[PDB]
Amino acid sequence: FSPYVFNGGTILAIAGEDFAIVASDTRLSEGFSIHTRDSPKCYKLTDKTVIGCSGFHGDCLTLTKIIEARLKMYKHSNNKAMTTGAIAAMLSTILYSRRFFPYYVYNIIGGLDEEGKGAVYSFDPVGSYQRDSFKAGGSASAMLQPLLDNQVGFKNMQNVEHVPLSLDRAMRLVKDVFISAAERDVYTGDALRICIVTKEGIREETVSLRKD
């Protein structure tokens, strides 16, 4: 009896000066069956924080429910919505709480920090908790993150002006990277959901993606 069945996932997150982006495919495919073509893997935890979870779907749902219940607990017991850093630390503790039967949920939190800039945290199931600039996770992470290394940090590149990553270029980056991921990764596909987070709120944009 195997208590984990890799249900497939591709989440990506980009930080920035003002905007925080969290994109995720919408293919909830178990084993060899794409048995749900619509299953967003990004949840709006607050008005400044969006969580993307990849992996076993039951644990994804359970972790999301636990996190949101804890947001309500924090709000009642502290009369203030959690900050992005606070949610990151709390999720670290929640994940490590069960360190002897781990959650199979790779997590990427993206939101505005206290100052107001985009902040992205990356996790491993046991609870390692890093603050990155841009990070991809799930199944196609290996093929989404490197191109962002090329085009967001300008690694292996010079004579390049480090102009701030604008929102328009960030959206173009995400769209192209996920189109390539759909082309060359089967758990990708079945539409893309992009979450764009700024002062206005958690704007959601969705793009039709190769359905195969």
Binding site: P3, E30, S33, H35, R37, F56, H57, G58, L61
Partner: protein
């Protein structure tokens, strides 16, 4: 339930524009020794919810016990509230998730159909705990071969009338009887609509073996 002792087979579900129609064989299997055959695998949870499992029928009966007891308690309260299809789906998802975490899985796979507040619900609570709502559901080994037809039919024609959705589920159960070593040409197509839940007895597909000869 570690070993699956006496198991069922596939269970289907489609979204009629004014109802949710689910289908289940009354077969009872024991590893190619088909036992009890007039076993109802579909339950009328309440006026606006119905359930159908495809794993171990004993665990299906336990879940029938718990769900029936819970709905009886709700009515007893009689405050007028009712278990929405989404509510039953979440309860069932948590039940299976807890049973898994205890490493005591509920070796079932359940479609939860219902009609509520001008909405149609159809969910897939599985053994481990994978749960979701989809326009068309097919559960068990028959899922692979059954979802294609429903998905393509909906994608080229989203809204399905009751008659055509029904005919589609009989066709799907026919292909199941044709391509499922653990099927039986005697099924129940329960339907929930704004009126209620109707379990229309032991139907039978017109298996045209002569079509292939």
């Amino acid at each position: 339930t570690q070993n699956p002792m006496v198991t069922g087979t596939s269970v289907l579900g489609v979204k009629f524009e004014g109802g949710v129609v689910i289908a289940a064989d009354m077969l009872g299997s024991y590893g190619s020794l088909a036992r009890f055959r007039n076993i109802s695998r579909i339950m009328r949870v309440n006026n606006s919810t119905m359930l159908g499992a495809s794993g171990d029928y004993a665990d299906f009966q336990y879940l029938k016990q718990v769900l029936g007891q819970m709905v009886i308690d709700e009515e007893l309260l009689g405050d007028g509230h009712s278990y929405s299809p989404r509510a039953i789906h979440s309860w069932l998802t948590r039940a299976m998730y807890s049973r898994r975490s205890k490493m005591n899985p509920l070796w079932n796979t359940m479609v939860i159909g219902g009609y509520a507040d001008g909405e149609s619900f159809l969910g897939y609570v599985d053994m481990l705990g994978v749960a979701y709502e989809a326009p068309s559901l097919a559960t068990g080994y028959g899922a692979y071969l059954a979802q294609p037809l429903l998905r393509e039919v909906l994608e080229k024609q989203p809204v399905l009338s009751q008659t055509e959705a029904r005919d589609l589920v009989e066709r799907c159960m026919r292909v199941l009887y044709y391509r499922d070593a653990r099927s039986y040409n005697r099924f129940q197509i329960a339907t929930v609509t704004e009126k209620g839940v109707e379990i229309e007895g032991p139907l039978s597909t017109e298996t045209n073996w002569d079509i292939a000869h």
